[model samples]
Target: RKFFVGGNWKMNGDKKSLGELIHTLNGAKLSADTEVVCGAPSIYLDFARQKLDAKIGVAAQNCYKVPKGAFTGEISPAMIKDIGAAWVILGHPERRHVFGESDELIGQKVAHALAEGLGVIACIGEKLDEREAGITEKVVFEQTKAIADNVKDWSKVVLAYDPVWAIGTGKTATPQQAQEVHEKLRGWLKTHVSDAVAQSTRIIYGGSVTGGNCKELASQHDVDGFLVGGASLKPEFVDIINAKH
Candidate 1:
């Protein structure tokens, strides 16, 4: 595999626009070795999947912990899977800071989603203050610690490091900065989890990842791929998808 590139549409797009976005991805000449996934908003998941290229998988932006329950307004992993989405993004910064999801709850959701056989893009990163305080690793490790035990198969999970300040801020971590954190994360996995997990797990980056910086970031040893946000909604996302080329 070359590298993975995921377009997280977030809360944007509607039926017609999403259809157009899918058409663009299907028509673009994406790298042959790159694995592409689209994280469509929950409302348009089934619709996006129906139109997206089979080579490109669809992901639910968020999902509840259980397979089913009385949690009104909450989508479940089973429902996401039944709707034909193979992946779910959990622990995103907005879900943590804006929506107030705790590390424990995110961990629970990851466990449940994995149990349901859905691949997980488990996000973990720190805010600007945490980075400024030089404890970025502490924050990221804490987030991953919550879900480390729940991951049975590393292949089905990807860890996306999205610094809060960098997300949507148009300020990206330098390739070196991103690689430093990614390397530390891999080291943490080697010690806390297992060497095999450290070596095999894909540690992708997010937050302000544009086509301009993607290639350099992709060249870093520990930086695996991307979990793109805003740019995912535009045709430029095709350029990011082919960055490695």
Candidate 2:
């Protein structure tokens, strides 16, 4: 796919709102070639799948590494797979920084999702402090390395680079800034992984991806798609989906 834009309405939305959002997506003239997925909370997956078009798939915001068990407060890969979900987001910074998930834990989760036949939008990014300290490359490379170490198959993995600094605050990574990181990722892939994987693996951008500026970023070579944030919750999301325009 040339551009795959996913709307991650993270911890946001309810029944009525989700219904309306689906209506908006259904109404939008999204490119048939572009892949569009919207992930809501785990509870909303069934609703989204039943209500949205088949072309626009639904995903779970997160899933545990285990297949099945009595783990309170944890939703396993089996549950996500059994629910007819094709995609699941893993390693989101919020899960790590806020929920105390370790890098190893996230890698395990990716492997579990893959084994369950679920696709993954594996998130990786650097914080403002890390970026300012010139450790952005290290941060991203380490994160990707961990995933690669665990999950050798990249066909189902879509790397989403959501810079912590640029997620909110109304300031986005300049096109140049995004390109720099994307290029670095491609180089890292070539050296650390096979060249075939480097060429086909989709490295999507995330964090503050609004309708206004998505097109510019979409123009970049290494930029394969997006993992949208705040903007994904509004009518503007249609514009974001149509970035190829």
Candidate 3:
């Protein structure tokens, strides 16, 4: 399978800096087998489209489920795709716990994105407390099942297993810990969805992935790719993108 590297420039970069970053990233060489995606601020998706090449794709870090509306603070998947972003992350834990989005709602967004021909990276994971209590699988299972129940033929879906414990704070799970969850997610998928979908869907990791540590995570069997946070802001991002090399 091809490796995918996504840079989540969450709430970062002004217009000028964004332009410089995109230009730098565009000029960088990427392996044909590696797909590079940058989830820039929604305000810059169109700008990014103009600056990037075909090998590099742009994404919206977050998107609303609606097709169109006076939703005020929301940007729909349709709008994101129409503007040239091929991807949008849905149901991130931050959007869930911090913001108050429900799994059912995120699942609807997944179905909507698929209908619009937009690829979706569905985020699902357990919190630190849940994992410590040994309910990690249960928590993730419910989240996965919710999305699966709402969307059919998940061929367009990319599952991002970003353990809440590992996000920010500079804390990371060992390669073994991360791989265990990824492996477990695949096992669950085989039973819930088809074995084919289970094997084919990309399960990318998120949470403090940096050039120094990404190689270790990349080497794990089930870690198909990454969803980087802080490291995505600098030139070291190119190194993280090449971790699999």
Candidate 4:
């Protein structure tokens, strides 16, 4: 699998700051081996797409399940594509916990997003309590199953494992901890989806990832890439993208 790195800005940037960030990214030397993407907030999707290097992809942090609707605040995958973004991140733990979105609803969104031709970064992981209860595998498996059931083309999906317990908490899973889950996810994919999908799909990690920790995480056999959060808004994100180097 090719190295992949996603800088998820979350809700953190305004145009001025984001523009500066883009300028840095546009001029920075990046690894040719990595498939880098900026998961921009909805309002800056177009801004990031135009200013960032064409080689670096842009992804909407979220989107609705349908192309058109009276669903008020939601944007559709079609709109994301129309703006030249080739991807969308779905089932993020923030959306799951903060927005009260259900697994079935996320599955529907994932299903529709792919059907609309947008590459999906499907996130799955367990919360602190779930992990403490010793149901980490069970929790992730259920979430993966939900997303997997709705997937039509495994080719367009990148599985992101963001342990909810670690996200933004300054706590990261050890490289070995992350690799074990990535390995188990591969096995699950082989048994439930197909051996091809298991071997080919990229399983990226997120949750408190920073420049200092990224290199070790990238060294893991099953750890294909990273879905960076807070550090993505800082200049050090460039180092995180070149983690594979």
User: Any runs in candidate 4 off by more than 4 Å, and if so which?
Assistant: none
Off by over 4 Å in 1: none
lDDT of model 2 at position 84: 72
lDDT of each: 0.90, 0.87, 0.86, 0.94
lDDT of 4 by residue, 40-86 (tens): 98998998998888999999999989889799999999999999999
Residue-wise C-alpha lDDT for candidate 1, range 166-212, written one tens digit per residue: 89999999999999999999999999889998988889999998978
lDDT of 2 at 46: 83
Q: Which one is best on lDDT?
A: 4
Q: Tell me the tens digit of each residue's lDDT in model 3 across 132-172.
A: 89999999999998898877767778889988888886887
Clashing pairs in 2: none
For candidate 4, the per-residue lDDT at 233 reads 91
Models 1 onward score TM values of 0.98, 0.97, 0.96, 0.99
List CA RMSD, all candidates: 0.9, 1.0, 1.1, 0.7
**Against the correct fold, how does model 2 do in TM-score?**
0.97
Question: What's the best-to-worst order under TM-score?
Answer: 4, 1, 2, 3
What 10-residue stretch in candidate 4 is worst by lDDT? 44-53
Clashes of 2: 0
Clashes of 1: 0
Clashes of each: 0, 0, 0, 0
lDDT for position 162 in model 2: 89
